[PDB]
Amino acid sequence: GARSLLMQRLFGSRVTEVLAAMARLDLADAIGDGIADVHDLARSCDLPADGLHRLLRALAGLGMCEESEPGKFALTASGALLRKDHPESVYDFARFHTAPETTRPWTNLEQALRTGRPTFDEHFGSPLYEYMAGHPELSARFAAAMRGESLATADTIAEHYDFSPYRTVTDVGGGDGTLITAILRRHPDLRGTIFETPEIAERAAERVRAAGLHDRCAVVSGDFFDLVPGGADLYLVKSTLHNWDDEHVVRILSSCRTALADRGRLLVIDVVLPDRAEPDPAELNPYVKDLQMLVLLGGRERTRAHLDRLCARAGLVIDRVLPLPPHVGLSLTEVVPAPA
């Protein structure tokens, strides 16, 4: 009821600390496929048996583990996803979103709401993407974190959008190529380009080779504020526009408009907020995403009306917004050049 829901919201930070400890101590990999004894696990992570037991009991209480017998633990399907080696692993995602880099800025949430600018810069001394460009191990974690987040979209997009009419697709800020890989895997004759920062482009180039898509997926690097590489039939921009304030978004959509020319189409893959906020079945709460974008980057999530205006301004019209399955929490906004 009403009181239980409030209690659940209030104790979220303590729940996150329990999950953060599981992730940092690599307990999911320690347990793996079997039933593990707390005493055996205790010698794997430099915690005493009693302390590790209480942590594992909380993880069982939170649906991440099962205590089959006293002191004997197996993973649930949820806990299995924190294994580094799970085929659907979100281990790096879990580490990224529990790192000081992504959590310390939330300690100043009110300042971010007051100033309208990110608190990340205050805590770490530069904007997030500049900071990561100078911290290769955080950059590495971020690339893997966005892969983990994008799995839900990558696994569903090609079943909710017809890619068959296109010869070429360019993913603008396409990360390590998780999204474009999933699309190319379903369309053998389709050709791809990932457009990224030089740093992330290095990760994407290796991913494309590792995935055996080198022959029909290229990687190009640059600055989507400077330009987007031209000549493609379809442009994707996923989980990118929400990183930026309204003016920076127009500048990105402006680079996209030039690339579209006559016969180009843009697919904006992002949260489309309703005009009136309400509870959402998305795996990741879109209003928490909105405030994450504020504190980390000075970005935000947007309604169809807020984006339709930013398109209008870039010389683009929102043609059509297509849904994904409710658990994904992103929509496909088709954008074409404005008739003007």
Ligand X SMILES: Nc1ncnc2c1ncn2[C@@H]1O[C@H](CSCC[C@H](N)C(=O)O)[C@@H](O)[C@H]1O
Ligand Y SMILES: CCCCCC(=O)Nc1c2sscc-2n(C)c1=O
- Does residue 146 belong to the site contacting ligand X (CB under 6 A)? yes
Query: Residue 168 to residues 139, 176, 190, 193, 216: CA-CA distances in angstroms?
Result: 28, 18, 6, 8, 9
Number of residues that bind ligand Y (CB under 6 A): 11
Only one residue has tokens 């906020």, namely 277
Backbone phi and psi for residue 150, each to the nearest 5 degrees, phi listed first: -75, -15
Structure tokens at 279: 């509870």
User: Is 120 a residue that touches ligand X (CB under 6 A)?
Assistant: no
Q: Minimum CB separation from its own copies for residue 153, in Å? A: 12
Give the nearest distance from C-beta 238 to ligand X in angstroms.
Answer: 4
| Nearest CB to its own copies, comparing residues 55 and 190 | 55
In three-state secondary structure terms, 175 is coil
Pick out residues in 100-159 that bind ligand Y (CB under 6 A).
Answer: 102, 149
Residue 284 is a binding residue for ligand Y (CB under 6 A)? yes
Could you tell me which stretch among 92-100, 119-127, 168-176, 315-323 binds ligand X (CB under 6 A)? 168-176
Q: Residues 196, 208, 257, 270: which binds ligand X (CB under 6 A)?
A: 196
> What SS3 state is found at 168?
strand
Closest by Cα among 189, 198, 194, 197 to 207: 194
243 binds ligand Y (CB under 6 A): yes
| DSSP label at residue 9 | H
Q: Which of 247, 248, 226, 228 is nearest to 237 (CA)?
A: 228
168 binds, among ligand X, ligand Y, its own copies, none (CB under 5 to 8 A by kind): none
- Does residue 11 bind ligand X (CB under 6 A)? no
Does 296 bind ligand Y (CB under 6 A)? Our answer is: yes
Does 292 contact ligand X by CB under 6 A?
no
Q: Up-side HSE of residue 89: CA atoms within 13 Å toward CB? A: 17
Query: In the 8-state DSSP scheme, what is residue 35?
Result: -
State how far the Cα of 80 lies from the Cα of 64, in Å rounded to an integer: 8
Phi first, then psi: what are they for 181, rounded to 5°?
Answer: -55, -55
Q: Tell me which of 97, 242, 248, 327 is the catalytic residue.
A: 242
Give the C-alpha separation, 187 to 166, whole Å: 10
Q: Does residue number 289 form part of the binding site for ligand Y (CB under 6 A)? A: yes
81 vs 146, which CB is nearer to its own copies?
A: 81
3-class SS at 291? helix
Of 73, 93, 120, 224, the one binding ligand X by CB under 6 A? 224
Question: Does the annotation count 242 as an active-site position?
Answer: yes
Q: Which residues are catalytic?
A: 242
Binding site for ligand X (CB under 6 A): 129, 146, 150, 173-175, 178-179, 196-197, 200, 223-225, 238-240, 243
Binding site for ligand Y (CB under 6 A): 11, 102, 149, 239, 243, 284-285, 288-289, 292, 296
